[PDB]
Amino acid sequence: GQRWELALGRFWDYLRWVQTLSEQVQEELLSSQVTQELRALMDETMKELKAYKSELEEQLTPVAEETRARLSKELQAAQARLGADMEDVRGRLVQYRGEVQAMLGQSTEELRVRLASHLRKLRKRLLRDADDLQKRLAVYQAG
């Protein structure tokens, strides 16, 4: 894949592990290591995506200009959606950390069930937006 796709792939691999919510995951969630790592992986994905779009603009098919503008704005919106989705994942995990830190030594099982359900929905959104972004990038040059 492209550099940005490999960066997103590392985000996916790390998130899949987090979604197991094992005791190893819990340790890294409560220390903030998980959200620092997701921030790093998100930032790298977005940096590579912006650089990729910039290089694609060196190999464009000429089109009506109105069309090129439309497609460029649609692509920028798709990039922004991806970044917002990754940040929503990270923010939901920050929320979980704060809730666990407020509850002394009480059982986190219900919190974990609710987190797992929510993360599944956030992953669905990130995945549909990533696939949409790849579709737009694939037809961007031909216009």
Residue numbers in the entry: 23 to 165
Study text:
Human ApoE is a 299-residue protein component of lipoprotein particles and a key regulator of Aβ aggregation and clearance. Compared to the least frequent isoform ApoE2 (C112/C158), the most common isoform ApoE3 differs by a single mutation (C112/R158), whereas the AD-associated ApoE4 contains two mutations (R112/R158).
Despite the crystallization of full-length ApoE4, we could only obtain ApoE4 NTD structures (residues ~ 22–165), but with well-defined loops conformation. Two NTDs (chains A and B) formed a T-shaped or V-shaped molecular building dimeric unit that stacked with another adjacent dimeric unit, resulting in an elongating crystallographic fibril. This ~ 25° angle difference between T-shaped and V-shaped packing was retained in both the orthorhombic and trigonal space groups. On the other hand, 5 of the 7 ApoE4 structures have V-shaped packing, indicating an ApoE4 preference for this packing pattern. The “domino-like” effect of the C112R mutation was further exacerbated through the H3 helix up towards Q123, which directly influenced a tilt between chains A and B. The side-chain of Q123 was oriented upwards in the T-shaped packing, while it was rotated downwards in the V-shaped packing. The upward orientation of Q123 in chain B was stabilized by interactions with W39 and T42 of chain A. In contrast, the absence of this interaction in ApoE4 structures resulted in a tilt (~ 30°) between chains A and B and the subsequent formation of a geometrically distinct V-shaped dimeric unit.
